[PDB]
A paper describes a structure:
One major class in microorganisms and plants is the phytochromes (Phys), a diverse collection of dimeric chromoproteins that employ a covalently-bound bilin (or open chain tetrapyrrole) prosthetic group that can assume two conformers, a red light-absorbing Pr state and a metastable far-red light-absorbing Pfr state. Through fast photointerconversion between Pr and Pfr and slower thermal reversion of Pfr back to Pr, Phys acts as photoswitches in detecting light fluence, duration, photoperiod, and the ratio of red and far-red light. The bilin is buried within a [name] domain pocket, which through numerous chromophore/protein contacts provides the unique absorption and photochromicity of these photoreceptors. Besides canonical Phys, cyanobacteria express several variants, including a [name]-less subfamily that harbors just the [name] and [name] domains for light detection.
Here, we began to address this controversy by generating an X-ray crystallographic structure of [name]-[name] as Pr, in this case using the full PSM encompassing both the [name] and [name] domains and the connecting hairpin. This fragment assembled as a head-to-head dimer consistent with other bacterial Phys but included a unique [name] domain dimerization contact involving a 15-residue sequence previously defined as the Arg-Ile-Thr (RIT) motif that is conserved among [name]-less Phys, and relatively straight and parallel α-helical spines uncharacteristic of most microbial [name] structures. PCB was connected to the [name] domain by a thioether linkage between the C31 carbon of the ethylidene side chain of PCB and the sulfur moiety of Cys138, and was buried within the [name] domain in the expected ZZZssa conformation for Pr. As with canonical Phys, the pyrroles of rings A-C along with an adjacent histidine imidazole group (His139) and the main chain carbonyl of Asp86 fixed a central water (designated pyrrole water), which participates in proton release and uptake during photoconversion. The electron density map of the hairpin region easily identified one strand of the loop as α-helical, and like the Pfr state in other Phys (e.g., (10, 20, 26)), employed a serine (Ser361) in the hairpin to contact the [name] domain via Asp86 within the Asp-Ile-Pro (DIP) sequence close to the chromophore. Superpositions based on the [name] domains comparing the bilin position of [name]-[name]([name]-[name]) to those in the Pr models of Synechocystis (Syn) [name] (25) and Syn-Cph2 (20) and the Pfr model of the bathyPhy from Pseudomonas aeruginosa (Pa-BphP), showed that the [name] domains and the A-pyrrole ring positions aligned well despite photostate differences.
Author numbering: 12 to 117, 131 to 280, 284 to 405
Amino acid sequence: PSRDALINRITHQIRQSLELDQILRATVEEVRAFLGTDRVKVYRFDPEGHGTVVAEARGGERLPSLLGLTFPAGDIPEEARRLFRLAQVRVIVDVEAQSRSISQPELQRPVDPCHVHYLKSMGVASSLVVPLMHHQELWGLLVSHHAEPRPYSQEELQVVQLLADQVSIAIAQAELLEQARQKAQQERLINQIAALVYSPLHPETTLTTVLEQLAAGLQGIGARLRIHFMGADTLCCHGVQPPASYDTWLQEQLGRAGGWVKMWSLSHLEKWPELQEQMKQTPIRGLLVAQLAWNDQPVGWLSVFRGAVYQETHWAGYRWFTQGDPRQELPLISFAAWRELKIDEPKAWSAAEQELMSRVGVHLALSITQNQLYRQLQ
Ligand SMILES: CCC1=C(C)/C(=C/C2=NC(=C\c3[nH]c(/C=C4\NC(=O)[C@H](C)[C@H]4CC)c(C)c3CCC(=O)O)/C(CCC(=O)O)=C2C)NC1=O
């Protein structure tokens, strides 16, 4: 009926863009408009299971904004994620009655008291959670909260489920486009670095920009390059730098020959407590290192540095972070917990980024070896 026309229009709106942010904003807005509820949100999960409120629509100021909030994976037990990975919608109509209805696509159960206390503390009277699948995994959740009690029609449930399936498809296609674009940008960065590597300009001028653009494309707070080959011993830096002893460290752990690419977090430097502490006194929390050695002989070292991942977000820009709404008590505690897990942990680099590091390192090693052999034959 008019239901199918509504689903058609909303699906057109969700699928209009291949940009993930536009997809999720259209999703939350359209679903909140359909349901008339106070707050509709999308929670996205990371590989470790931690959740981030990545999109949000509100009908007014009755419920506070949670956009940008992050919470530890443990806030949703694996027992709940099991049901969600088996495609399962969960509605709590009354928080005071503590009822929990569970429905499948295509009658009342109890609910854990801790989650009831959580929803009460946020001033949430009614909750509807629909899972968002990506291939076989649980990409995230579509969440509708309301400050007064309200039931949910079965046709409302099926409309939200069908919209969730369209959201899943849009997520997959946006991912296809994003992977293509990232592959393009990575190859472009490799070639742009090679453009400056063999350039006849002053090495200190070109290589500093090389390190700067390398740090840029790998979202690193800094970059460093130490060449120690034949008669050439040089050190170029950009951005945040480690203590100089780091260089000597890389020379004494060469057996961990040839060329390689390695990742390290601050935690991985537990063996060397003095270097670990010096590194701590630095914003550096992650290191991507490439031993420049295209030939069998070691040539140098190329490093990119990332900070702690928590610092990568302007948490003070959010309303929930600074303003003392009591309903933000338990969410903020959750955030605190998450902050305790990622206060010294960096964002890891992908396998594609490590391969990029390896390729840039091969270019660097070959270039330096060629130049030094040409200067030694003189
Ligand atoms: C963005 C702010 C926010 C957070 C963080 C949040 C947490 C949260 N707790 C959930 C469930 C759950 N959470 C818990 C347990 C707990 N959870 C805790 O934070 C405690 C540490 C612990 C109790 C001691 C349990 C047991 C469930 C499953 C409840 C059930 O369906 O029976 C779910 C899954 C949705 C659902 O099935 O209702 C979410 C999203 N909800 C929000 O809106």
